[PDB]
Design a protein around this ligand. Structure first.
Ligand SMILES: *[C@@H]1O[C@H](CO)[C@@H](O[C@@H]2O[C@H](CO)[C@@H](O[C@@H]3O[C@H](CO)[C@@H](O)[C@H](O[C@H]4O[C@H](CO)[C@@H](O)[C@H](O)[C@@H]4O)[C@@H]3O)[C@H](O)[C@H]2NC(C)=O)[C@H](O)[C@H]1NC(C)=O
Ligand SMILES: *[C@@H]1O[C@H](CO)[C@@H](O[C@@H]2O[C@H](CO)[C@@H](O[C@@H]3O[C@H](CO)[C@@H](O)[C@H](O[C@H]4O[C@H](CO)[C@@H](O)[C@H](O)[C@@H]4O)[C@@H]3O)[C@H](O)[C@H]2NC(C)=O)[C@H](O)[C@H]1NC(C)=O
Ligand SMILES: *[C@@H]1O[C@H](CO)[C@@H](O[C@@H]2O[C@H](CO)[C@@H](O[C@@H]3O[C@H](CO)[C@@H](O)[C@H](O[C@H]4O[C@H](CO)[C@@H](O)[C@H](O)[C@@H]4O)[C@@H]3O)[C@H](O)[C@H]2NC(C)=O)[C@H](O)[C@H]1NC(C)=O
Ligand SMILES: CC(C)[C@H](C)[C@@H](O)[C@H](O)[C@@H](C)[C@H]1CC[C@H]2[C@@H]3COC(=O)[C@H]4C[C@H](O)[C@H](O)C[C@]4(C)[C@H]3CC[C@]12C
Ligand SMILES: *[C@@H]1O[C@H](CO)[C@@H](O)[C@H](O)[C@H]1NC(C)=O
Ligand SMILES: *[C@@H]1O[C@H](CO)[C@@H](O)[C@H](O)[C@H]1NC(C)=O
Ligand SMILES: *[C@@H]1O[C@H](CO)[C@@H](O)[C@H](O)[C@H]1NC(C)=O
Ligand SMILES: *[C@@H]1O[C@H](CO)[C@@H](O)[C@H](O)[C@H]1NC(C)=O
Length: 743
């Protein structure tokens, strides 16, 4: 057959235009393509090709001429294959059914896809996650009316009535339409698409009309979430009898929960809206089929109605961030056999934990009661039932008292324990080290005393250890060296003593290290510069002495921070008003806690919290090849001179070496820190002239060189003219504006 001779030559030609050789090493001439990797054959004839997740790095023109023209080819999967360029006219095999070009660098107007109409048998098309757009006026049509499945999601499409453009030539055969994650706005009319089952217009710019669904005869999945929609969606979906999933979350809908089609409903999300009232009784109509419910981020109140006990298929119930009050409805919750996730966080649920809660320790994967008015002791009988399935236990930001039950070790599947922000006293039970799967241990802001258990070394999966603001004494356990997956360690505000161990450098995943307000002594380890992930170091208010090692900045430029991202935090800026407040600012973990309860720190901290709070999710300014972003060693007994290597950290935002015994002169390399915002070298024995090179710093919003032996003229260029005289005071030999003219 000529087609067989043609098949092999086209495949090999495609291999040869690949910039990277050896990418398809088993592809070779004078061999049967059915033996090639990525190829699928039926009766010794290629029917499908899959080169997904291979960095092909070639233009679409290569694909179209070599691959899409192959006789008998039924499907082609090139997802995440690093293909760029634009789609354009080409001869397409009439047998081609599915084409996946998702997650690539395809560019140009979305009108380029119309040329795929040369594929007569095309039915499935995935061009999601590319850079396709819609320049200027929207006119004409996509003109692919034979498609059953189309995914234009996560592109750069921006325009009004782009959906109408897609459906202009007809949607009679269309079963699945996803256009999510764009900037499309205007009207959505799928009433002519009588076989439509899946519709996702989420994360767009729709601010006016709700999609018109017509008879809505075949619709099962409807996602309009992540828009600016308001109005009466109830009436719009009222005719949809086959509806299974309804996601209207993150919109501007108001009022009480309206009527919904419940008979086939599996998933329902009303989350992140302006809905009010209490959970109506009529929702019991979904209890036969309802798998998941999310009412979070609204103004709902009252108590969880009793009818929920009839929903035995409900796997997930999220009522977080509302005004639900009363005690824990253990009556209804025990009637739900299939519930694996309970989230009542950020509510006003009050009272002590009922003893029947222990029954859900063998059922629930996630129990989140964080930020509530719960009081009394933590149930010691928690996880009494054998084979406990509990993974996440969030009890933070409550009125819990007493001791941490050592019995919590009986929950062996626990990956996250958050007991922070409570009135818990006693010590940390050493049995917690017996948790082989534990990743996050957060107990901060409690009255916990004693020492940090040495037995924690038996947790090789440990990632975050947050013990801030307790009465913890003793030294850092030598066994923590065995936890190599540690990224976030914060032991600040305790009475901890000893030194930073030399094995600290052996933690290659360590990103944040905060030891402030302790009695830590000794010298700063040179092995701190063996940490490849460290971007945040806060050692302020300790007994550290000796000279700053130059080697600690050795990884500068090599730093890689990845796993640290995505974690919720508060950063409380230091108000320079009060002398009792130390450090540049307080970085603290803040998952599942209200900023409104930050006043609980008032008794434990001298700093004023008023208008100095920054809240977000950890977001490094780089991925690989970065540097330390934060460095604070202020209020210590550090001596010697600042090493010139200090200026090797271009991503450093803040540098506070204030209140030390550091001598010498400010190195000229400080002027190479081009990302620097704050620079506090005040209250030291620094002498000499301020290096003119510091005039190159364009990002400084704050500086303090006061209380030093600095002399000579202040640099006249740069940002020095911006800063007030107060920042240079108590420097006898220092002159020039903002100070008086030199003599
Ligand atoms: C068009 O292409 C896009 C891009 O691929 C595609 O979106 C992606 O769909 C896949 C599913 O095929 C998603 O991947 C899943 O992610 C969830 C978590 O959200 C995982 O739990 C899933 O794991 C399953 O699959 C794995 C192997 O694939 C198994 O190892 C595992 O045990 C589970 O069985 C699954 O990986 C992905 O998140 C999205 N988004 C992306 C990739 O950006 C879209 O679906 C395509 N359109 C159509 C109509 O198919
Ligand atoms: C019900 O609907 C809600 C709301 O839509 C939904 O929660 C959302 O899930 C989506 C996942 O599909 C989230 O989308 C991502 O969010 C992250 C976090 O910020 C972003 O970084 C992501 O950005 C990428 O994707 C964009 C395209 O969407 C790209 O333009 C961008 O460059 C990135 O590649 C992405 O937006 C979304 O954040 C949440 N929203 C909320 C409020 O939780 C929920 O999953 C739905 N539930 C069901 C069962 O369908
Ligand atoms: C390092 O950690 C130690 C130990 O936590 C810490 O010492 C604490 O400092 C706070 C900050 O002031 C002290 O809090 C005080 O406690 C007394 C009770 O003895 C309160 O009466 C005080 O209340 C004042 O503030 C209230 C509102 O904020 C007012 O209503 C009231 O009238 C007072 O003005 C005050 O809060 C705490 O007592 C000490 N504890 C100990 C054991 O020393 C230290 O500050 C930390 N160091 C650094 C640099 O952070
Ligand atoms: C990488 C993470 C651990 C880190 C928290 C990161 O997520 C977060 O964005 C950090 C970089 C933020 C949190 C607080 C921010 C600072 C907030 O408070 C600071 O005083 C302001 C003051 C001034 O505005 C400076 O221009 C920025 C500056 C100095 C910000 C520098 C960057 C931050 C320090
Ligand atoms: C496609 O990617 C290659 C590889 O970098 C590049 O040389 C080429 O210019 C790109 N084409 C377009 C149209 O951007
Ligand atoms: C959303 O739509 C409005 C109205 O057409 C428009 O003014 C606005 O620019 C759009 N937003 C984006 C991000 O394109
Ligand atoms: C939340 O509910 C409680 C219950 O009594 C009520 O006192 C409080 O005012 C409610 N919150 C708001 C903002 O109305
Ligand atoms: C630092 O303090 C320790 C005692 O805590 C002392 O032995 C050591 O000599 C000091 N370092 C310097 C450089 O003086």
């Amino acid at each position: 057959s000529q087609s067989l001779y043609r098949e092999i030559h086209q495949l090999i030609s495609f291999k040869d235009v690949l910039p990277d050789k050896n990418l398809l090493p088993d592809w070779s001439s004078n061999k049967n393509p059915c033996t090639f990797d990525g190829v699928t054959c039926r009766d010794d004839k290629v029917t499908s090709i899959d080169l997904s997740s291979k960095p092909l790095n070639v233009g679409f023109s290569a694909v179209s001429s070599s691959l899409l023209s192959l006789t008998g080819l039924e499907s082609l999967f090139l997802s995440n294959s690093h293909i760029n360029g634009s789609v354009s006219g080409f001869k397409c095999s009439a047998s081609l059914t599915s084409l996946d070009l998702s997650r690539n660098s395809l560019s140009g107007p979305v009108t380029t896809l119309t040329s795929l109409g040369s594929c007569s048998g095309l039915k499935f098309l995935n061009v999601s996650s590319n850079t396709l757009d819609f320049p200027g006026k929207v006119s004409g049509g996509l003109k692919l009316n034979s498609l059953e499945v189309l995914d234009l999601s996560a592109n750069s499409i921006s325009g009004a009535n782009v959906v109408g453009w897609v459906l202009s030539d007809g949607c009679g055969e269309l079963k699945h339409l996803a256009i999510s994650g764009n900037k499309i706005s205007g009207d959505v009319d799928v009433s002519r698409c009588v076989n439509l089952e899946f519709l996702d217009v989420s994360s767009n710019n729709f601010s006016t009309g709700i999609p018109f669904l017509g008879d809505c005869s075949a619709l099962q999945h409807l996602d309009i979430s992540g828009n600016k929609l308001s109005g009466d969606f109830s009436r719009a979906i009222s005719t949809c009898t086959e509806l299974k999933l309804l996601n209207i979350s993150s919109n501007q809908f108001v009022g009480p929960i309206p009527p919904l089609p419940l008979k086939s409903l599996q998933y329902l999300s009303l989350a992140e809206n302006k809905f009010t009232g209490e959970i109506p009784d009529f929702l019991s109509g979904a209890c036969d089929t309802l798998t998941g419910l999310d009412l979070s981020g609204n103004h709902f109140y009252g108590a969880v109605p009793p009818f929920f006990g009839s929903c035995s298929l409900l796997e997930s119930l999220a009522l977080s961030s509302n005004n639900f009050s009363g005690e824990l409805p253990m009556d209804t919750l025990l009637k739900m056999r299939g519930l694996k996730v309970l989230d009542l966080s950020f509510n006003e649920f009050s009272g002590e934990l009922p003893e029947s809660l222990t029954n859900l320790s063998a059922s629930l994967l996630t129990l989140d009661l964080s930020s509530n008015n719960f009081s009394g002791p933590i149930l010691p009988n928690l996880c009494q039932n054998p084979k406990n399935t509990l993974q996440e236990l969030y009890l933070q930001n409550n009125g819990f008292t007493g001791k941490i039950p050592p019995t919590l070790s009986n929950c062996s599947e626990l990956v996250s324990l958050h007991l922070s922000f409570n009135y818990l006293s006693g010590t940390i039970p050493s049995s917690l080290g017996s948790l082989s799967k534990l990743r996050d241990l957060k107990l901060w802001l409690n009255m916990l005393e004693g020492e940090i258990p040495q037995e924690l070394m038996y947790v090789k999966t440990l990632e975050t250890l947050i013990l801030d603001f307790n009465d913890l004494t003793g030294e850092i356990p030598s066994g923590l060296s065995n936890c190599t997956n540690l990224n976030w360690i914060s032991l600040s505000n305790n009475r901890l003593t000893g030194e930073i161990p030399k094995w600290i450098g052996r933690l290659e995943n360590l990103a944040i290290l905060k030891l402030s307000n302790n009695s830590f002594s000794g010298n700063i380890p040179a092995e701190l510069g063996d940490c490849r992930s460290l971007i945040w170091l806060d050692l302020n208010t300790n007994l550290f002495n000796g000279t700053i090692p130059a080697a600690m900045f050795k990884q500068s430029g090599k730093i890689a921070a990845n796993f640290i991202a995505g974690k919720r935090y508060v950063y409380i800026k230091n108000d320079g008003m009060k002398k009792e407040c130390h450090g540049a600012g307080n970085l603290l973990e803040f998952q599942g806690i209200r900023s409104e309860q930050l006043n609980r720190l008032s008794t434990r901290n001298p700093c004023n919290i008023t208008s100095r709070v920054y809240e977000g999710h950890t977001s490094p300014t780089f991925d690989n090849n970065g540097s330390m972003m934060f460095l604070d060693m202020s209020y210590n007994m550090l001596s010697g001179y600042i090493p010139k290597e200090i200026g090797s950290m271009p991503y450093l935002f803040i540098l506070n070496l204030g209140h030390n015994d550091i001598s010498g002169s400010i190195p000229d390399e400080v002027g190479d820190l081009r990302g620097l915002n704050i620079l506090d070298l005040s209250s030291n024995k620094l002498d000499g002239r301020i290096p003119q090179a510091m005039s190159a710093l364009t990002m400084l919003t704050e500086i303090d060189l006061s209380n030093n032996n600095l002399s000579g003229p202040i640099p006249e260029m740069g940002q020095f003219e911006t800063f007030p005289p107060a920042k240079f005071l108590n420097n006898p030999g220092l002159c020039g504006y903002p100070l008086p003219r030199c003599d």
